[PDB]
Every structure is written in C-alpha cells, then in structure tokens.
C-alpha cells in the first residue's frame, strides 16, 4: 500500500507473467510515478522541454490526443519501453491517466473541455508487412503498412456495459503492390478506428498503422474449416501517411529574372526530347487561368483543356505519366476524383457522352429511381488520340482524322498534331539522347547531383512547390489599354477566315486567348496580364486554329496571318 519500489527493483519480474506483474498496486503506482517524472522532465539538447511544449498546444487546438515518440521513451527509463512493447493494453491505461495530470498542470479544469486523453505512440522501431504476422504476435504492439482498400461509414457505439457513446469505423488494409513477392496474390487485414481516428484516411491511400494485434472466437470460421480456428483484427493506436518565407523569396527571385517562362517550359518533361509546343500547352494547362461569373447571363471557366493527336510512338503516354507524377491531384484513364485537378486520357459511346456533358457543364447532375443528386467536375482535361487508324493525313481537315463531334473541337482550348517526321539530323539527335539517357539510368551523392543538374535547368522539387504556390496565391487580371487592339485583331481574323471560305473563328477562341494570357501571367507570378502575354496566347490559338484546316486554306491563312503567327 504505502511503500513504493525503486526503478532498479522493477528490473526483476517477480510474478509468473508480465501482465500479472504490471497489474499489482505497488508496481502500478511505481510505474505511474516514473512516467509522470519522465513527462515533466525530458529535454532537447537545448533544454526546451518538448512535452511541456506539446501539452501547451494541446489546449491551443482544443484537442484530445497527446503524441509521444517511442525513441524518447527508450532513451531513458528503458524498462518502461520494454513493458510497453510487451503489454500495451495495460501500459497505455496507466499512461493515459498520467497524461491527464500533466495537462491539468497547464490548464486546470480542462476536464470540462474533454473528459479523457489518449496517448498516441510514434516511431515504433520494427515493421512487418502482412506476411510476417504469426500467433506469437498476439496482444503485442505492431507497426504495419499498406493501401486502404475499403472504408465503412462512421457510426456511434456504446462505450460502457446512464449511457455514453464513441465514434466507430472499420477499414480494410491491403499489401502495397511494390512489397508483394512475384507470382503471389496480396494479403488483407481489417483495422478498427475509434473516437479521434475516424475519417483520418480515404480509399486508395497508402497508409502506415501502429496498434495492438488481437483475436477472438468466431463460430462460422470454426464451422466451415472444421478446426478450432480463431479470427484476428488490428486495433489502431495511431495512423500515418506549406512553405517558409525563404521559399517565397526564392520564388520571387527566380520570377524577377528574364526568360522564366521559357525556363519553366524547358524544365517540362525532361526525359522527352523535342516537342516544345506540347510542353508549352501542358505547362499552360497545369497553371491555368482564373474563373469568372456574371449573374447577368454568363460564366467563364479557369481550367484549360488540351487535345493531342499522336502518330504511333510520339511520346504521348510518357508525357501523361510525367504529368501524373508532376501534378498535385489527378485522374488517369471518375471525374469526381479530378475535382479542382487535372484529368488525363491516353486512348479512346457512353464514355464520350459523359465527356460531352462534362465539357458543357462544370458540375454533373444525375437522377435514378426518383433520387436526385449533384457532383462537381471543375477540372482541366488533357487527352490524346490516334488519328483514325495508322497515320494522320495532312491534306485533310481535322474532322476527317478523328472520331469526335464538332463541339468537342470547339470547346477544347488548344488542339495540336504531332507526327513522326523524317530527318537524318533529328533522328541522330533523338538516337544520341536516347542511348545517353539509357546509360545514365543504368543500375550500375555527387553522382546524383551531377545527373540531376544535367537533366533539367530547374530542380523539379522547387518547380512543383512553385506550381502549388502560384496556383494557391496568384490571381491575375487584364489591362484595359490594349484590349481595343485585341478586338480589332479578332475582327480581322474573322474577316480573313470568311474571305478564304474557312470555317469561322468564334467567341470561344477569344475567351481561350484571354484565359491563356492569364495563365501566362500566373506562370511568372504576375498579377497583371501584359501585351506579350496576349501576343503569346494569340500565337498559340492562331497556330492551333490554322493546324485544323485543309492544305490550300492553310497556305492562305499563314500567308495572311504572318503578322500574328510570327510577327505582332
């Protein structure tokens, strides 16, 4: 009762098992005193007691979970770490009851905010996949990794058996495909999430879990297998998966330099040679414009949509894979998952019908059995296609080379055609670059730095951070001076289109020009569009419009349009 053990007295487990030793009153009181003495006293090398600084922020966020690193608990009072690894279900009860004392020392009457606090363990120093688990692991703490395959809804559950409840949710976890050995199927396990941990993860995420490994009787398993076979589950204890002023100043430094637009385009898709216009269009789509709306009868999207007609083997699928790794959020082939992101299509009636609705709208609506509901698309579409068989025909307009309705070609902001042209010098350049890249990739720090800096003019980590910063912070606008010239150019282009008997230029093209100019302003972190932005946007759209036409019309257009496609 009154007397307490020394820490050295705990070195000898005196009962027949760990659990029956931890649960004794004098041992338990000793452990409680020692844990409280650790939590009030552990330090950085700089002093600066971390847990006194964490409890402080627990109340600043009105939170419920205190987080403890295992390495700190192993760095002093090692026996408590050993007992925690062996008997988590007991040790964590004592530790939670100590954590409440420590928090009330900062914030008296915190019990009125939350009645009970949970300790979360981090950095447990050994890991298993779902292969290595065996019966010896039962009731031990484990650390596991995988992909979350399926998730239930959240429900309340009765806490005690006057009443009290807690939140509950189950998650199915599967081995990551990179970990699975060759020629074997992946394994599965199911995880239980309680009060603070529900909806911490989403289906398809790759996730890391710490918790107790636990089992129970199940009648159906016994009945079907015909042997006394128990079922097992994991009870999670913790689950795992911005910028400074220095980054902002660095971004602004590079943006202040001349030619930053060209350098960003050059950094785009380093492994692919040539095809600068495709890289330009992809960069413009990833940065995008600004959305606008006028409740008097009109709305304008900020997203930029691009379509690429590809000869066989002209790098299309590689740049889509590159964009998939570059972009913040994306879908590859579902438009709900592409919300405020980029959507990627590499090959191609109901699918096309869905895309017809998606290009007309920015939000999707559906009804079924009298139910009615709505969803958001709000995304930029990058698509590629094979031109109606083995090879494109340049003598014909674009419609002859595609399996698309006319409004698709109207509503795509940018159209482009890529062809396997014949040139000895280009072939030699391609072949030299290809074998050079092949050698540079061979499995057989300084080597990496040289390789990286030869690969690109911008480090791509900085470029991804820069794209995210620009997308979240920069919102450009037009300047009202040069817009008279834009209107005159629009009228001139329409007059020339009619004069040669071309299909006419339209308001959609003018809108696309303004949107692309906004994107060009965003690329250099400029809140103003400028004359050169309008010039570049005009060149892109005019050249794209010219590429869609028949050959005789193409010659008349380029002869007249020289003062836009090349001059300004």
């Amino acid at each position: 009762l009154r007397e307490e053990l020394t820490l050295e007295s705990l070195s000898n487990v005196k009962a027949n098992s760990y659990s029956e030793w931890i649960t004794q009153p004098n041992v338990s009181r000793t452990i409680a005193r020692e844990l409280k003495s650790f939590l009030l006293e552990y330090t950085d090398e700089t002093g600066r007691s971390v847990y006194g600084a964490r409890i402080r922020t627990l109340g600043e966020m009105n939170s419920e979970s205190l987080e403890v690193n295992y390495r700190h608990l192993a760095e002093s009072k090692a026996i408590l770490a050993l007992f925690l690894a062996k008997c988590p279900e007991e040790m964590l009860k004592i530790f939670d009851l100590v954590a409440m004392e420590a928090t009330e020392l900062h914030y008296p009457d915190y019990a009125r905010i939350h009645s009970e606090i949970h300790v979360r363990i981090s950095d447990f120093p050994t890991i298993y996949s779902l292969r290595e688990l065996r019966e010896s692991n039962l009731s031990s703490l484990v650390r596991v990794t995988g992909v979350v395959t399926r998730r239930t809804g959240v429900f309340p559950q009765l806490k005690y058996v006057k009443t009290v409840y807690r939140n509950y949710q189950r998650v199915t976890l599967q081995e990551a495909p990179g970990t699975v050995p060759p020629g074997r199927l992946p394994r599965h396990r199911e995880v239980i999430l309680l009060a603070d941990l529900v909806d911490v993860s989403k289906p398809g995420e790759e996730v890391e879990v710490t918790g107790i490994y636990k089992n129970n009787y199940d009648g159906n398993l016994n009945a079907k297998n015909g042997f006394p076979v128990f079922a097992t589950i994991i009870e999670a204890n913790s689950i795992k998966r911005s910028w400074t002023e220095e980054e902002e100043r660095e971004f602004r430094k590079i943006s202040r330099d001349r030619g930053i637009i060209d350098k960003i385009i050059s950094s785009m898709a380093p492994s692919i040679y040539g095809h600068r216009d495709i890289k330009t269009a992809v960069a413009c789509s990833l940065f995008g414009g600004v959305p606008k709306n006028v409740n008097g009868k009109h709305s304008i999207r900020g997203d930029i949509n691009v379509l690429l007609l590809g000869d066989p083997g002209t790098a299309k699928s590689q740049i889509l894979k590159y964009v998939e790794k570059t972009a913040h959020r994306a879908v590859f082939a579902a438009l709900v998952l592409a919300d405020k992101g980029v959507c990627l299509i590499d090959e191609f009636d109901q699918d096309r019908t869905s895309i017809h609705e998606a290009m007309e709208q920015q939000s999707i609506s559906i009804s079924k059995a009298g139910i009615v509901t709505t969803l958001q698309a709000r995304c930029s579409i990058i698509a590629a296609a094979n031109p109606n068989g083995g090879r494109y025909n340049s003598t014909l307009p674009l419609a002859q080379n595609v399996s698309l309705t006319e409004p698709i070609l109207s509503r795509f902001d940018i159209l482009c055609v890529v062809r396997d042209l014949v040139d000895e010098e280009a072939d030699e350049r391609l072949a030299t670059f290809v074998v050079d890249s092949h050698v540079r990739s061979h499995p057989e720090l300084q080597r990496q730095r040289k390789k990286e800096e030869e690969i690109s003019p911008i480090p791509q980590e900085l470029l991804m951070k820069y794209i995210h910063y620009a997308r979240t912070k920069i919102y450009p606008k037009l300047h009202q001076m040069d817009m008279d010239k834009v209107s005159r150019v629009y009228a001139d282009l329409r007059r020339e289109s009619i004069s040669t008997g071309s299909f006419p230029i339209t308001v959609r093209h003018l809108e696309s020009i303004l949107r692309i100019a906004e994107s060009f302003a965003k690329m250099r972190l400029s809140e103003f569009v400028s004359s050169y932005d309008l010039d570049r946007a005009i060149k892109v759209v005019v050249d794209s419009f010219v590429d869609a036409q028949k050959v005789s019309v193409r010659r008349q257009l380029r002869r007249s349009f020289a003062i836009y496609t090349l001059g300004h």
């Binding site: 027949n16 098992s17 065996r134 394994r187 009787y217 042997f227 006394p228 076979v229 097992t232």
Partner: protein, 153 residues
C-alpha cells in the same frame, strides 16, 4: 524474465519408400504414414489454432487449465470449486492458453498422370508450425504426413 513455456517439438520424416497419387487415397489407409504429390491451386491465409485452453469462472474466483480441443471449440464441464455450481459465462484466458499456426492448401492431380477419358481429382491439405506459407499457387510439390477424417462439426 518471467517463466518460459515449454517448446512444442515436431518430428518429421522423409525418404519414404513410395509416393501415391491423390486418386489412390482410400479409407483402408486412414491414420497410416504416407507421401503424396500434386500441383497447388489455392492457399489460405495463416490463422491461429487453439491447441490448449484455460478458463476462469465468473461467479467465483476459480481457474481451469490444460483443456483439450480436437475438432471443435471445447469448454469445462464443472466449476472446480465446490462452493459454486455455475457452468456458464466462462472466458478463455488468451495469455495462459496456447495456439498454433495453421494453413489450408488445395491440390489437384498432375496432368501427365490422368487416365484415359478421365479428369483430375482434388484434395485439401493442412500445414502447421514452421511449414506455413512454404507452398505457392501453380507450383508442383511433394507432401508427407497422415491422412485423417474430419467430422460435420
């Protein structure tokens, strides 16, 4: 350290005189020692099997130990303390009881051995201890052990 439980040794045999086919399993050989070969087609995940059990009474502080299972989950017949008569509300002490690793696998006859006009038969095999997850689907294997008979639990 606290006390350490006993090691569950396993005896194993090899180089038996002859190998039978799945088609040669017949009820006269039940409980004898044999060897078999075939192609693996399915495998189950590893599960814990209850080997020896230990229970404690709800109505009084009493404990029952080393209860033996065979094919179905089995519990005590009396309260050992004569001051109590309750037979209900036992709980299995997971710390004091002992488990084993268990895996089910499924095999079918070798294609080159099938007789004229016939089709391949199949069989279910049990693996335990340090031999679980050794087998792989689509591989060819040789097994040895004893054939048994399992009830309708």
């Amino acid at each position: 350290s606290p006390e350490q439980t006993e090691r569950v040794f396993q005896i194993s045999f090899f180089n038996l005189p002859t190998v039978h086919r799945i088609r040669d399993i017949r009820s006269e050989k039940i409980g004898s020692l044999l060897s078999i070969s075939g192609t693996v087609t399915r495998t189950s995940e590893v599960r814990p099997e209850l080997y020896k059990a230990s229970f404690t009474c709800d109505m009084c502080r009493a404990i029952v130990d080393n209860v033996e299972q065979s094919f179905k989950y089995t519990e005590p017949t009396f309260c050992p303390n004569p001051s109590c008569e309750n037979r209900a509300f036992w709980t299995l002490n997971v710390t004091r009881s002992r488990f084993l690793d268990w895996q089910k696998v499924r095999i079918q006859e070798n294609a080159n051995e099938i007789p004229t006009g016939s089709m391949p038969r199949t069989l279910d095999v049990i693996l335990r201890g340090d031999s679980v997850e050794r087998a792989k689907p689509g591989d060819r294997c040789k097994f040895t052990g004893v054939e048994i008979v399992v009830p309708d639990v």
